[PDB]
Amino acid sequence: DVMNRLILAMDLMNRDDALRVTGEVREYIDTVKIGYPLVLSEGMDIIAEFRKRFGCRIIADFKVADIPETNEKICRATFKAGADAIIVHGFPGADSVRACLNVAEEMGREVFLLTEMSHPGAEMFIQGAADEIARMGVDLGVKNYVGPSTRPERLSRLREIIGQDSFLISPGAGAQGGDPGETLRFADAIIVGRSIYLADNPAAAAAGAIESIK
């Protein structure tokens, strides 16, 4: 369970701006998604910086998509840096997912399995594999999933596959055109990035998001 069903996608690329904006909306969220735009710009230490400053859960959105051996290394370094969870692509297959699950279990952290993506290009290859990727996750005991706000019927199908007990978060609301309300019919929380962090008043944008799903 995530505060206000709202996860901030902090994809600003310098620490001052990222910390300032996160500080502006800190009252509205307790979970922040940090990805490569911020990490590759400021270093992995930025994760510990967020956890200390905001007391928030951090999901490391690294879309892990390598062979098992390399996946293990990526997960180890990421959890060592303090991430509570890591997002892993399902498309590379079950061995690559299991590698991540092993490290997460060892270290007491979580894996989120990325099924279908929210952007148009997801239609080409990912969409056709997505139901089976979700099922693979279920079969392996994965409990956390990511699916697209921009395709409510796909999101609904993924929820059907993973069951009511699995945790499902969903990006694509706001900038990419997804609707928070519709999305939360199926997802437990929505991921929101630009529509908050590029807003003239990010606190107002966050409050507005929450208001509309009150």
Ligand X SMILES: O=c1cc(O)n([C@@H]2O[C@H](COP(=O)(O)O)[C@@H](O)[C@H]2O)c(=O)[nH]1
Residues lying near ligand X in the complex (CB under 6 A) are found at 9, 11, 35, 61, 66-67, 70, 114, 117-119, 146, 148, 171-172, 174-176, 191-195
Q: Which does 192 bind (CB under 5 to 8 A by kind): a second copy, ligand X, none?
A: ligand X
The catalytic residue among 33, 52, 63, 80 is 63
Q: Which does 4 bind (CB under 5 to 8 A by kind): ligand X, a second copy, none?
A: none
Alpha helix (H) residue ranges in 108-201? 126-139, 152-162, 180-183, 194-197
* Count of residues making up the chain: 214
Half-sphere exposure of 126 (CA within 13 A, CB side): 16
13 counts as binding a second copy under rule CB under 8 A: yes
Q: How far apart are CA 30 and CA 3, in angstroms?
A: 6
- The residue (of 53 and 119) whose beta carbon lies closer to ligand X is 119
118 counts as binding a second copy under rule CB under 8 A: yes
Residue with tokens 């979580």, as numbered in its chain: 110
Catalytic, 63? Answer: yes
What are the angstrom distances between the C-alpha of 72 and each of 67, 92, 105, 159? 9, 14, 12, 28
Residues in contact with a second copy by CB under 8 A are 11, 13, 35-37, 39-41, 43-44, 62-63, 65-70, 73-74, 77-78, 81, 89-97, 117-126, 129, 132-133, 136, 176, 194
